[PDB]
Amino acid sequence: NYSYIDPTQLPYDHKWEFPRNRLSFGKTLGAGAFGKVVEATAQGLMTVAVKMLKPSAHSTEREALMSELKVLSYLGNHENIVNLLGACTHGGPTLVITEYCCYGDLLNFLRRKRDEFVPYKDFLTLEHLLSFSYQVAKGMAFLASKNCIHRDLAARNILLTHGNITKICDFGLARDIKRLPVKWMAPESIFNSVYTFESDVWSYGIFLWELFSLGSSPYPGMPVDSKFYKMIKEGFRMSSPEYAPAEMYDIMKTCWDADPDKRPTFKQIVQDIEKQISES
Numbered sequence: 001n002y003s004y005i006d007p008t009q010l011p012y013d014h015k016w017e018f019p020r021n022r023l024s025f026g027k028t029l030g031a032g033a034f035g036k037v038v039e040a041t042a043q044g045l046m047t048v049a050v051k052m053l054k055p056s057a058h059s060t061e062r063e064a065l066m067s068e069l070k071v072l073s074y075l076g077n078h079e080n081i082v083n084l085l086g087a088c089t090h091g092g093p094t095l096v097i098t099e100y101c102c103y104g105d106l107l108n109f110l111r112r113k114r115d116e117f118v119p120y121k122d123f124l125t126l127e128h129l130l131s132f133s134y135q136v137a138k139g140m141a142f143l144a145s146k147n148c149i150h151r152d153l154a155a156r157n158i159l160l161t162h163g164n165i166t167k168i169c170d171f172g173l174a175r176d177i178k179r180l181p182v183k184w185m186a187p188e189s190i191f192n193s194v195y196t197f198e199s200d201v202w203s204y205g206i207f208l209w210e211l212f213s214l215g216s217s218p219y220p221g222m223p224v225d226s227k228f229y230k231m232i233k234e235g236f237r238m239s240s241p242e243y244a245p246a247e248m249y250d251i252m253k254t255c256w257d258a259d260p261d262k263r264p265t266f267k268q269i270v271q272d273i274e275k276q277i278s279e280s
């Protein structure tokens with residue numbers, strides 16, 4: 001007589017419905033063979049992003065897009081996620097309208113800032129990197145508090161907008177807890193297809209390594225092959241990235257514990273980074 005409420009089973013909430021012909025589409029923000037995200041103007045909702053599938057997409061991607069709409073509808077608003085603003089469902093393919101983040105993804109932002117960075121006007125600083133790590137931890141703590149896992153946390157899925165605010169995007173693989181980004185995945189996810197709050201924490205560790213290397217690719221010179229899998233399973237881990245303070249590398253190392261039970265929670269990570277910020 002007692003059941004979990006699965007957000008993907010709930011009905012669409014028509015409060016999100018927006019007239020389709022009041023969108024005016026602009027530049028491409030992301031694209032693949034079966035879908036794209038475009039900038040648009042939305043009369044009566046301002047600048048927004050619109051996620052949509054291409055006519056070649058199969059029914060599985062279409063179901064996945066509606067599921068993502070339903071997860072975002074359930075989660076509610078948070079400063080550190082790219083929030084749902086509206087949807088178009090009647091008489092056409094699903095359009096998911098989200099917030100537009102004017103500075104794009106953090107991976108590309110960090111990479112173009114390498115010549116304008118001090119590791120301590122218009123410069124990226126260590127204070128900014130600490131802030132970004134704090135905000136992403138706050139956003140992931142929010143997801144976990146709603147029993148949600150993201151499953152593709154990476155610097156490429158963190159966007160930057162005004163006020164130096166970072167926002168987690170792309171909830172297409174996000175799941176409620178009752179082809180794959182292998183180098184960001186926890187070993188139990190690779191080996192046993194198991195995803196948990198603790199495997200999101202592993203990915204956050206990889207994200208921190210990206211952050212404090214200003215966007216370097218993880219495990220450089222190590223292709224995904226049988227040798228990569230054995231080395232991760234037997235305990236190989238990346239070294240401290242070049243700009244990480246010792247306290248942040250300590251967080252990374254615990255995020256990468258082979259035992260999920262020994263990894264920190266996002267709530268614990270938030271409180272850790274909070275103490276580091278106050279010490280500054």
Ligand SMILES: CN(C)[C@@](C)(c1ccc(F)cc1)c1cnc(N2CCN(c3ncnn4cc(-c5cnn(C)c5)cc34)CC2)nc1
Pocket residue numbers: 029030031032033034035036037049051052053065082098099100101102103104105159169170172
């Ligand atoms: C990977 N998948 C396979 C797809 C293709 C997909 C899957 C299913 C679909 F049905 C449709 C598409 C995909 C999903 N997601 C995204 N990204 C793109 C970035 N995007 C943004 N969202 C809000 N604002 N914003 C501002 C900027 C910005 C500002 N300056 N510059 C230079 C860029 C970028 C964004 C968030 C999501 N791209 C591709």
